[PDB]
Design a protein around this ligand. Structure first.
Ligand SMILES: CC(=O)N[C@@H]1[C@@H](O)[C@H](O)[C@@H](CO)O[C@H]1O
Ligand SMILES: CC(=O)N[C@@H]1[C@@H](O)[C@H](O)[C@@H](CO)O[C@H]1O
Ligand SMILES: *[C@@H]1O[C@H](CO)[C@@H](O)[C@H](O)[C@H]1NC(C)=O
Ligand SMILES: *[C@@H]1O[C@H](CO)[C@@H](O)[C@H](O)[C@H]1NC(C)=O
Ligand SMILES: *[C@@H]1O[C@H](CO)[C@@H](O)[C@H](O)[C@H]1NC(C)=O
Ligand SMILES: CN/C(=N\[N+](=O)[O-])NC[C@@H]1CCOC1
Ligand SMILES: CN/C(=N\[N+](=O)[O-])NC[C@@H]1CCOC1
Ligand SMILES: CN/C(=N\[N+](=O)[O-])NC[C@@H]1CCOC1
Ligand SMILES: CN/C(=N\[N+](=O)[O-])NC[C@@H]1CCOC1
Ligand SMILES: CN/C(=N\[N+](=O)[O-])NC[C@@H]1CCOC1
Lengths: 208, 206, 208, 210, 208
């Protein structure tokens, strides 16, 4: 009968926080999905928005796996004990303020789930925020230092309901969210960095 | 035993990253907010900036010692202890802990952590300037531990969350009610227990 | 013996996380604020932003060394020492410590810690612009140690008040009075000793 | 049979973050190049600008080298494991806010690439920002403590589009960027500190009108 | 023969960051000199200024010394590896924001040079800032915990241009800077703390 302590100790002994856990020469498949919680500050003049979102991050490290028939199937682990993908929002203009305890969930099969609530300010299109059509703010998120052969990022294919966890008390409302995959290259070099482009279509609530 | 020995033993047997479940039962965390001040309120953005003592209580029996011929209680830095990963679900700033980050550990293994916190929330501020006042609901629960691992309960002390509130604030508290809740997410089957603190307050005067 | 030996010995025998109670008696902490500046005052919100030296004095006999043929006093980083967990009960910001975080330790084990602090409080600012001025009450005591473990006493040596106060502030100090108190909470039986500092101040250069 | 694990372990064992990796007694050649991403806040009165830029930093540390015949030729490494040039913007008036994960890329030969996205406020000439000619804000960046014999700084010859990665959503636009080398000495002492002077010619966007 | 690595290793082994490096029982001679780079914000009413300056700090630690006939005569060292004087600006109302890499320069003889660029806000006389004569803002800087017998502070009097490194783009200009030695004592106690008093004579540009 394994206990939570044994599970953590095993993770510590095999997990290498600064070493990407590539199997063979294949990329690590990171799933990335934003659930928007609040839109706090919007500036149509500067084209800047301040947003709060849960950044659901999923990937696999099979070296962490254990046998969970007669033991817990999942444990909470501080991210300092784990390798974590070096995700960056490419159009952010502030560092991400992580609001929640920095713990990830590891499952007996080796799936890791890290989902911090983040508050961050972005440069994006705020034109039309006070119209019926609303504004569309595009947020690009991907690895900062790992190219397509080392990390691939994919939008999760979950749920669908956009305003599901969104504050009813915000001054804004969400019309639609669409998450699509992209791939930026830099003229310096031949490698491609995969990203997810989250399109946030929102507008001021108005009237009453 | 000397207080040094007690602390050394706590260090050596405490596991800050390991939830101290007895058997297969959840850890019973008691959570109670005592509001001290309301600093900033915005009826338009529905945001409040509040200061509150977050009284947090739970058991870790591995910490226990024999306190017949020794002190029954010590102050311990939380970095030496497992601490529940509580989050305010509708907070829009990180909690600014104002006070020394020490908890109190009793010889039986009861822990009491009560930081003074300043934090900004998204909640209903409509009616803050009326007789009825506004009702701001703050939900607080574990971020990563579900109902089988952590349960949160509003302390059986159902006394005044007032009585500690600044007389010098521009606002007044009408009522505070602390209730248990249990949220689930459509992705998954697990439930996260929370306490929902309903703060009914209003601006002082006309 | 030299300053290096003194520090090494302090490290070996000092226990920063162990309150140095002699017998079962409380540690007698002396607490005294010298106000240096009043920066910002708000009659509407009842908030003040102040800078003050928080003179803190206590005894830790475990620190003691000889000092016939060695220095009688050293500057020691507070991380090497037990330090009382003082908190201002009506503060609304964390104390911003402006000065190097060193205490002074004497060979007998007397400790003097005196950081310059900038901190914001919730207190009575009514009447700040009158002849009588406002009286802002600041309560400071241990956060986790009750009356049997820590006692706090005002050292009121003496009543000079404006002695170190900035001549360049827009406010002036009329009087400071430091008195002892003892708060209890209805949940629980323990009493927490505090010092209540009454700051009587007013805007300079009034009409009457 | 760990591979990237072995690489990192070996870097830890032989890397000295506090030791400048001079080959012989020659200076370390640090290449420094800004790509401007955003201009956030501009004040013609105070002569202050708030800018976001990628600071492409390149140098050689042969102590990091490994043999990559039967292993990966490149890894991402946290900068705390590496010596990193002590670059400062001389006319900055805020600390650099690093926005991106603090990882550098190390190649098996010991070439290092560190490229943080930085947000920082500067004191520079903002006069004329609202004219056709725009303002020219000069940002000076060099080692803080290493003189010309220990660190040399060279502007890369990217020589490309200036507005290439610049936000279309900024209120400002870039007219031209020119990166040139300089070399300042102080009256106290005989040593010279090499820097790069980045001249940002920008202006408020026109009209939107018709 | 010996290399930068050896030099640093030796510094680590023999340096004691928390131990003042007094030779015999004589004070450590700290030289302190401000070069003003910018004046960012001034408030005539509150008597507050926000300034940026290089704080050139010089002292001797002979325990650090090495050979250097067949090796480098100087190295850059992180200050966390060194003892550093606990200097404080006595009339500061913000903590010093250090803008530059926190490295000092150590010479083979044991001379240390630490020169951080600092941005800090002070309480000083801003009266007359908008006149031809300008204001004179006095900044006092000295040890916080080490008295005259342990640390002495002396102005480097390098007879130079004051506005040499000062921003041409500031709204203010410097008329004169004068650095003189002083010595504060407190009524509680007999010990004297040596300081340097930096007198910044400056004024708003233009408007005439
Ligand atoms: C793959 C594997 O071995 N899984 C095991 C199973 O065989 C065993 O019944 C149980 C008790 O050890 O733990 C699990
Ligand atoms: C040039 C060099 O040093 N590279 C070596 C290579 O010669 C050798 O075949 C291989 C296996 O040990 O390791 C690597
Ligand atoms: C510890 O406590 C138990 C429980 O009452 C008691 O029986 C035992 O004698 C104690 N042991 C000592 C003296 O440490
Ligand atoms: C300390 O100093 C006293 C001074 O007289 C001396 O008697 C003693 O032997 C010294 N050594 C100890 C025990 O600290
Ligand atoms: C430094 O080392 C060299 C070794 O070649 C020696 O000749 C020299 O005298 C040394 N310096 C001193 C003064 O010890
Ligand atoms: C709060 N939301 C949640 N799932 N969801 O929204 O789909 N799971 C809890 C996460 C488990 C690990 O970090 C938090
Ligand atoms: C964003 N630009 C990029 N390359 N470039 O511009 O030439 N690479 C990402 C960097 C690779 C190493 O650190 C981050
Ligand atoms: C100051 N308040 C106090 N009790 N109370 O408020 O009910 N006790 C100290 C707290 C309990 C242990 O951590 C801090
Ligand atoms: C800026 N001034 C400078 N020299 N000077 O002023 O004479 N050197 C850089 C310093 C070298 C040691 O720490 C920083
Ligand atoms: C500045 N004021 C002072 N005494 N006083 O004001 O009564 N002592 C310096 C202290 C020595 C230990 O920490 C600072």
């Amino acid at each position: 009968s394994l206990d939570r302590a044994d599970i953590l100790y095993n993770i510590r002994q095999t997990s290498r926080p600064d070493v990407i856990p590539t199997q063979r020469d294949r990329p690590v498949a990171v799933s990335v999905s934003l659930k928007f919680i609040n839109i706090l500050e919007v500036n149509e003049i500067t084209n800047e928005v301040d947003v709060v979102f849960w950044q659901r991050t999923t990937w696999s490290d099979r070296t962490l796996a254990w046998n969970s028939s007669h033991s817990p199937d999942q444990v909470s682990v501080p991210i300092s004990s784990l390798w974590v993908p070096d995700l960056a929002a490419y159009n952010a203009i502030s560092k991400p303020e992580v609001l929640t305890p920095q713990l990830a969930r590891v499952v007996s099969d080796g799936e890791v789930l890290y989902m911090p609530s983040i508050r961050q300010r972005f440069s994006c299109d705020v034109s039309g925020v006070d119209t019926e059509s609303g504004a569309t703010c595009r947020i690009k998120i991907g690895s900062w230092t790992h190219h397509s052969r080392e990390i691939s990022v994919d939008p999760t294919t979950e749920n669908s309901d956009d305003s599901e966890y969104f504050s009813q008390y915000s001054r804004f409302e969400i019309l639609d969210v669409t998450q699509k995959k992209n791939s930026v290259t830099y003229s310096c070099c031949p490698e491609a960095y995969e990203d997810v482009e989250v399109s946030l279509n929102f507008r001021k609530k108005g009237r009453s």
